């Protein structure tokens, strides 16, 4: 569940708005093969803005699942946005976002937006992973 305006990659490589995704649309997975989106859902609520270095901010819902990497080389961990918000900063600094090109990115801030915002979401087959326009790996 991402904020409207988020740009995702189709199976061919071109971009598509998250609000423009429809049932059966072909997204791009982190391994290069295609993904099928289905069960489109929309809403409007106060979202969480995750600011990381280099890459554009990620605005998502409270129940959004983040595919992160944790130190101790690195281990792959899926964690929801709410639990990650509740973790202390000393623990938050151990988690990293990642993009497919295997670049690791520091998560350095995450705050709740002031005003509500429209959001769109869906489910993804296979490993349930898809790519953002900047190749950031995202989970259902
Ligand atoms: Pt979601
Ligand atoms: Pt909710
Ligand atoms: Pt997962």
Author numbering: 1 to 72, 90 to 118, 132 to 170
Published text:
Inteins are internal proteins that self-excise from their host proteins and catalyse ligation of the flanking sequences (called exteins) with a natural peptide bond. The fungal intein of interest here interrupts the gene encoding pre-mRNA processing factor 8 (Prp8), which is the largest, most conserved, and highly essential protein of the spliceosome responsible for mRNA splicing. The Prp8 intein belongs to the class 1 intein family. The Prp8 intein is one of the most widespread eukaryotic inteins, present in important pathogenic fungi, including Cryptococcus and Aspergillus species.
Crystal structures of the apo- and cisplatin-bound Prp8 inteins revealed that two degenerate cisplatin molecules bind at the intein active site. Our results further showed that cisplatin inhibited Prp8 intein splicing in vitro in a dose-dependent manner by direct binding to the Prp8 intein. Mutation of the splicing-site residues led to loss of cisplatin binding, as well as impairment of intein splicing. To explore the potential of the Prp8 intein as a therapeutic target, we developed a split luciferase-based Prp8 intein splicing assay. This revealed that cisplatin, an FDA-approved chemotherapy drug, is a potent inhibitor of Prp8 intein splicing. Furthermore, we used biochemistry, mass spectrometry, and solved a crystal structure to demonstrate that cisplatin targets the Prp8 intein as the mechanism for inhibition of fungal growth. In this report, we demonstrated that cisplatin, an FDA-approved cancer drug, significantly arrested growth of Prp8 intein-containing fungi C. neoformans and C. gattii, but only poorly inhibited growth of intein-free Candida species. These results suggest that cisplatin arrests fungal growth through specific inhibition of the Prp8 intein. Finally, we found that overexpression of the Prp8 intein in cryptococcal species conferred cisplatin resistance. Because the processed Prp8 carries out essential and non-redundant cellular functions, a Prp8 intein inhibitor is a mechanistically novel antifungal agent.
